[model samples]
Target: AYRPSETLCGGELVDTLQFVCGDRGFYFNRPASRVSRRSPQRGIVEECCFRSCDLALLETYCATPAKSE
Candidate 1:
């Protein structure tokens, strides 16, 4: 499975996936629902790692699918 070593926080509201490399922290989010709307919509999760963060690596990691046994 595509699992991160640490999960800071997450839920139906907003979930976080985290992985630390070197001195930098990489962050990713899971799909979240917009319950406030009459016709609820799911928000697309995006990468938030900035500055020296590696976008290519993060994108690759985010796109990776989990293994199923």
Candidate 2:
């Protein structure tokens, strides 16, 4: 399962993945919704959402799966 450690913002890949592609500003997208006081906080939950409802950085990726050895 691949992950995105950063988000492309202002022509730069920042250390933030929870970004609002709409009118709202960027945010952690975990604790809060939009750009809040804790916008710098980021992480990647290495598990399922149903098993770990209380998590963050649970977004998807387009990276192809690694070929089996």
Candidate 3:
């Protein structure tokens, strides 16, 4: 698992966030009170850690295309 940047976690920000890189996407952790929003339909990638987001992970996923089934 990748460790997210401190700025991405428990800072002056909302409880939930989403990151989209090219065809890949990621859903950051959300509060229990919040609802899970829509995720990537096709190129769904990885879920971020609790209260954290990783730009590094996003870059990695974006660079790598999804494997065909």
Pick by lDDT: which candidate is best? Answer: 3
**Model 2, residue pairs in steric clash:** none
> Residue-pair clashes per candidate, as listed?
0, 0, 0
- Which lDDT values do the candidates have, in the order given? 0.31, 0.31, 0.36
Query: Against the true structure, what is each candidate's TM-score?
Result: 0.20, 0.18, 0.22
Give me the overall lDDT of model 1.
0.31
Which candidate wins on TM-score? 3
* Tens digit per residue, CA lDDT, model 2, 1-69: 443522233333222222312223333224544656655544332233212311133333212222348
Worst 10 residues of 3 by lDDT: 40-49
Model 3 vs. true fold: TM: 0.22
Summarize candidate 3's per-residue lDDT along 12-33 as a digit string, tens digits.
2223233334434433332223
Q: What is the C-alpha local distance difference test score of candidate 3?
A: 0.36
TM-score sort, best first: 3, 1, 2
Error of 2 at 69 (Å): 41
Candidate 2 ranges with C-alpha deviation above 4 Å = 1-11, 14-20, 33-41, 44-69
Error of 3 at 58 (Å): 2.1
